[PDB]
């Protein structure tokens, strides 16, 4: 549905979704395949980045306000939703001051405490069909994949959940509600 992203989501994401999809051929009217799918690629990033910061020594903190203010810093950077030039300037600026690997294809987030790049990939497939479709292609490099499910069952790499359980619980309910409006749309 063309008004699936416009009635549900807030105004700031609509402009982000309106942006870089204009490049090949399709448009908001044609498909309900990869039109709205790009919208939540940024919403998950904001839920992942917000309410999470780092301390003076280098320790995790899950606070209230969310506007840094001097002593604390963002814990994630928004790679998706940028220009392809800025995207890799983000990636490369990281690798130059922390001796890390440079991923072949684009990641979507980066954790500053654990130094993990995060390629997001949630879909209607359960867990195993889409975890080893990417992990046996983006291998060698240690790109951290976080494979959720449409319902709630979870399976990360080694189940190494860097994120605390309060935010990831609300992340499940954020996708547990959007799943239900595919049928009624």
């Amino acid at each position: 549905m063309e008004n699936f992203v416009r009635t549900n989501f807030n105004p700031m994401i609509l402009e982000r979704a309106e942006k870089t999809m204009k490049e090949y051929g399709e448009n908001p009217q044609n498909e309900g395949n990869k039109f709205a799918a790009i919208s939540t690629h940024m919403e998950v990033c904001f839920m992942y980045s917000d309410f999470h910061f780092i301390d003076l020594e280098g320790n995790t903190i899950v606070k209230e306000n969310d506007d840094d203010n001097a002593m604390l810093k963002h814990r994630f950077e928004i790679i998706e939703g940028q220009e392809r030039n800025i995207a890799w300037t983000i990636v490369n600026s990281i690798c130059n001051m922390t001796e890390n690997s440079k991923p072949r294809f684009l990641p979507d987030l980066y954790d500053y405490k654990t130094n993990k790049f995060i390629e997001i990939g949630v879909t209607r497939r359960k867990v195993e069909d889409y975890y080893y479709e990417k992990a046996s292609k983006l291998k060698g490099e240690n790109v951290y994949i976080h494979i959720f499910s449409f319902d709630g069952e979870e399976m990360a790499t080694d189940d190494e959940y860097i994120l605390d359980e309060e935010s990831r619980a609300r992340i499940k309910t954020r996708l547990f509600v959007l799943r239900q409006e595919l049928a009624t749309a």
Binding site: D68, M71, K73, Q82, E83, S93
Partner: protein, 46 residues
């Protein structure tokens, strides 16, 4: 190459340059907020 704005691209570069210049470098904590405040001030002017 890029379809984005000249200003938005500079702003995007300003935010992350200030990031690594402090996070793992040699620029003070108060200066990171001094820059990102200006990027916010600029973003407000549209």
């Amino acid at each position: 190459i890029g379809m984005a704005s000249m200003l938005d691209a500079m702003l995007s570069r300003a935010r992350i340059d200030a990031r690594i210049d402090l996070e793992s470098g040699r620029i003070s904590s108060q200066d990171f907020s001094e820059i990102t405040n200006t990027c916010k001030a600029i973003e407000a002017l549209k």
